[PDB]
Design a protein around this ligand. Structure first.
Ligand SMILES: N=C(N)N/N=C1\CCCc2cc(NC(=O)c3cc4cccc([N+](=O)[O-])c4[nH]3)ccc21
Ligand SMILES: N=C(N)N/N=C1\CCCc2cc(NC(=O)c3cc4cccc([N+](=O)[O-])c4[nH]3)ccc21
Lengths: 286, 286
């Protein structure tokens, strides 16, 4: 099949930049400006509502939608993230220097904090869903793929608790203890991402062990290899450990992580602000 | 304000039959047939989707929608249930004879079984949401008010479990043990309803006790008053006890309740079938 007419009208399509299970990412040129864009193809919960979420969000570490076409397949137009996926930087036991880990992780934290402040949980944070702005090591990152995201709001539980529980089942009452911590799943995922970035290997995996992946995760017993970690700081590992806390209520939130000693780094923060300014292009100001 | 024009066009509105928090139930006459109908008014999750659920359901113990008007308020037209709410038969310590309890409860079980077979959970079963067809003690009952209902389907959990949990939080894995038993909340509610019908008083309540309502429910320790129950059979109480089981996985399902010795009653079942046939009105058959 061909590209939809409406897409062809505005864009010239070019080479493949990447592939997901859902579909490819293509290079394209916007006809009006002659500038490069990326087009994510998703073949035919749903995409239109994901796009609606992303249209409302406004944060420099969250991907922005330039255009959208709902045709035979879905075509999503966004700015080019020439660095590609974080995945490719950590695969095959490759690892980033601690400084680069901190810069990237600070931005992930700011992004996820913004999401949680805005009543959104991502629920699919992993290195394949972190995009890099450039091939330079010091670059902005942007979180993508909101296909598993969920919008927080007034729960069925809250409506039930406007009393009285004469006919209400005990398990609903018991669920009150732990309700409203769904966002903590993103903080766990961030912990796994950080672990992988610092060490070059996954904390929980079926590689050379008889402990099931499930038991590894529920017990919180990550695979600690001293020689790999000797090079990494104690402060970096300390943060990892406060994010990979099994009790979701005790787990570090994004606010707690941002206040952690590891992220109290004015150099890293200077670099991030420098990177933000480079990205413009602003209008004149009074 | 006035009734909507489209409603007035088809119906003549009459006296008030009842009141909810949401709004009244009115007597009306359908102009075409000159026959009596009930009109439920709900003032402006949502009603249109509730109406959509109820339009698809087809069971003699579940209320049917005749018409619907979405105007300043919502107007829902249904058959008249002249017996009114079950609530009025059990209030002020009044109680039904065991035989009448069995007939009504059998029908509630059939209704809720049908719901669960069809992927629907009611979540608001109580005596105010059970309607009686006539003022005769032996009558058909119909469950109403689907405003808290929920449609079962592929969960976020099921999509997550299509592996692999490298980045997945332990609490999600732990939730697997108890997932897919949301329907059991209806069985608990039925247990409370049955308790109230047989005894004339609620199993869990703040009346003359220092045990909090919440602690009463979560511990499963219902208020047992021997003198009130002496008249009721052991088989009736046995079923009550298998429905008011605190562990939702161990709780009786509607199928288990229907197979309970208390409901193995050919007289009651004869009466129900007789009542179904009276309700028609069928076309000629080959
Ligand atoms: N699945 C879903 N429901 N939503 N998904 C989404 C929703 C928003 C758009 C979106 C974009 C991406 N990915 C890219 O843009 C991208 C990958 C890549 C690799 C190399 C170079 C470049 N590049 O030089 O630009 C690249 N850009 C992956 C997933 C999704
Ligand atoms: N709240 C909501 N979201 N949906 N509610 C609903 C949705 C479906 C319609 C509906 C009907 C009723 N109730 C009646 O019909 C009714 C009460 C009554 C009392 C005395 C006599 C008669 N009668 O002689 O008929 C009566 N009919 C209560 C709630 C709801």
């Amino acid at each position: 099949s061909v590209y939809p007419k409406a897409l062809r009208d505005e864009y010239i399509m070019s080479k493949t930049l990447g592939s997901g299970a859902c579909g490819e990412v293509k290079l394209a040129f916007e006809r009006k400006t002659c500038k490069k864009v990326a087009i994510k193809i998703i073949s035919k919960l749903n995409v239109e509502t994901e796009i609606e979420i992303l249209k409302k969000l406004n944060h420099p570490c969250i991907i922005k939608i330039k255009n959208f076409f709902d045709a035979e397949d879905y075509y999503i137009v966004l700015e080019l993230m020439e660095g590609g996926e974080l995945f490719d930087k950590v695969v095959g036991n490759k690892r980033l220097k601690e400084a680069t880990c901190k810069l990237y992780f600070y931005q992930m934290l700011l992004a996820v904090q913004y999401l949680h402040e805005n009543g959104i949980i991502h629920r699919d944070l992993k290195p394949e869903n972190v995009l890099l702005s450039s091939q330079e090591e010091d670059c902005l990152i942007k979180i993508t793929d909101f296909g598993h995201s969920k919008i927080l709001g007034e729960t069925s539980l809250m409506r039930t608790l406007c009393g009285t529980p004469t006919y209400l089942a005990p398990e609903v009452l018991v669920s009150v203890g732990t309700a409203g911590y769904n966002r903590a799943v993103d903080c766990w995922s961030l912990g796994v991402i950080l672990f992988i970035c610092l060490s070059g290997y996954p904390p929980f995996s079926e590689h050379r062990t008889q402990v099931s992946l499930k038991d590894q995760i529920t017990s919180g017993k990550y695979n600690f290899i001293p020689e790999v970690w000797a090079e990494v700081s104690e402060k970096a590992l300390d943060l990892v450990k406060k994010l990979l806390v099994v009790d979701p209520k005790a787990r570090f939130t994004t606010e707690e992580a941002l206040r952690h000693p590891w992220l109290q780094d004015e150099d890293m923060k200077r670099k991030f602000q420098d990177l933000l300014s480079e990205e413009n292009e602003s209008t004149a100001l009074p």
